Design a protein around this ligand. Structure first.
Ligand SMILES: [Zn+2]
Ligand SMILES: [Zn+2]
Ligand SMILES: [Zn+2]
Length: 222
C-alpha cells in the first residue's frame, strides 16, 4: 500500500487536535460537552459537498449529542475566491447567530450550488441579505481574494488534498499532551478525500456511504 498518507498520526499532536476540535471561530453544531466529534472538510462551490451536506444534516439529527465541526477546504480544481468568500461569511454567521444561523446559511448556500451548478458572489450576498447576516462585504471579498483559508491550511497540513475529507474522534483528545496523544493515534479515524473520491461518481450514493461510515465510527467511540 504505497502512496497512503498516515493522516491519524499527523493529526495526533496537540496543535492539530486543538485546531480540529477547539477553534472557536469554526462553525460547529451540537453540544460543546459532546464526547464525540465529526470534522467535515467542505467546499461551498463543490456539487458533491452539496449532496454530502444533506446526508450530514440527517446525521446531525440522528446524533444530537455529537459535535459537528465544519472546516472549509475550497477545491484546488476551481478558483477559490467565491468559496473563500462564502466560508468567511459562514464564520460571521456563526459568530452572530451560533449553530442555528450557521446551519440556515449553510443549507441555503449549498442549495444555490446544487440548483445552479455553480456558486457566485451574488449567491452569497443574497443569502446574507435574506438571513440578516452583518458583514463588511468589501473587506471579506478582499480577504477571500488575498488569503488562503486557515481551515484549508489545516486540511492541507493534515494531508488532505481537498474537501469531502472527514475526521471522527473523541473530544477528550483535546485535553491530552503530546505523549498521551501519541499513545491514542488509534482513536483518530479518517475518511480521506482520496477515499471519498474513489467511491463512485454518483454524488448521492457517495454521500450515503460517507454518512453510513461516519455513523459506524461514531458508534465505535465510547
Ligand atoms: Zn490491502
Ligand atoms: Zn465536495
Ligand atoms: Zn483501499
Amino acid at each position: 500500500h504505497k502512496t497512503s498518507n498516515d493522516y491519524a498520526k499527523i493529526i495526533a499532536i496537540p496543535d492539530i487536535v486543538k485546531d480540529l476540535l477547539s477553534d472557536p471561530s469554526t462553525p460547529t453544531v451540537g453540544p460543546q460537552d459532546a464526547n464525540k466529534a465529526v470534522v467535515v472538510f467542505f467546499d461551498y462551490g463543490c456539487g458533491k459537498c452539496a449532496e454530502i451536506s444533506k446526508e450530514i444534516n440527517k446525521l446531525m439529527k440522528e446524533n444530537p449529542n455529537v459535535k459537528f465541526i465544519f472546516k472549509a477546504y475550497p477545491s484546488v480544481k476551481r478558483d477559490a475566491k467565491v468559496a473563500n468568500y462564502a466560508s468567511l461569511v459562514a464564520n460571521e454567521a456563526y459568530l452572530q447567530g451560533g449553530s442555528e444561523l450557521f446551519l440556515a446559511y449553510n443549507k441555503a448556500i449549498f442549495a444555490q450550488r446544487e440548483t445552479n451548478g455553480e456558486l457566485t458572489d451574488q449567491d452569497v450576498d443574497n443569502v446574507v441579505k435574506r438571513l440578516g447576516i452583518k458583514v463588511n462585504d468589501t473587506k471579506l471579498k478582499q480577504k477571500a481574494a488575498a488569503e488562503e483559508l486557515d481551515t484549508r491550511k489545516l486540511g492541507k497540513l493534515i494531508g488532505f488534498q481537498g474537501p469531502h475529507s472527514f475526521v471522527i474522534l473523541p473530544t477528550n483528545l483535546a485535553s491530552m499532551n503530546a505523549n498521551d496523544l501519541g499513545n491514542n493515534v488509534d482513536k483518530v479515524y479518517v475518511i480521506s478525500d482520496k477515499q471519498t473520491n474513489a467511491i463512485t461518481d454518483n454524488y448521492q450514493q457517495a454521500a450515503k456511504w460517507v454518512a453510513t461510515n461516519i455513523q459506524a465510527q461514531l458508534n465505535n467511540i465510547k
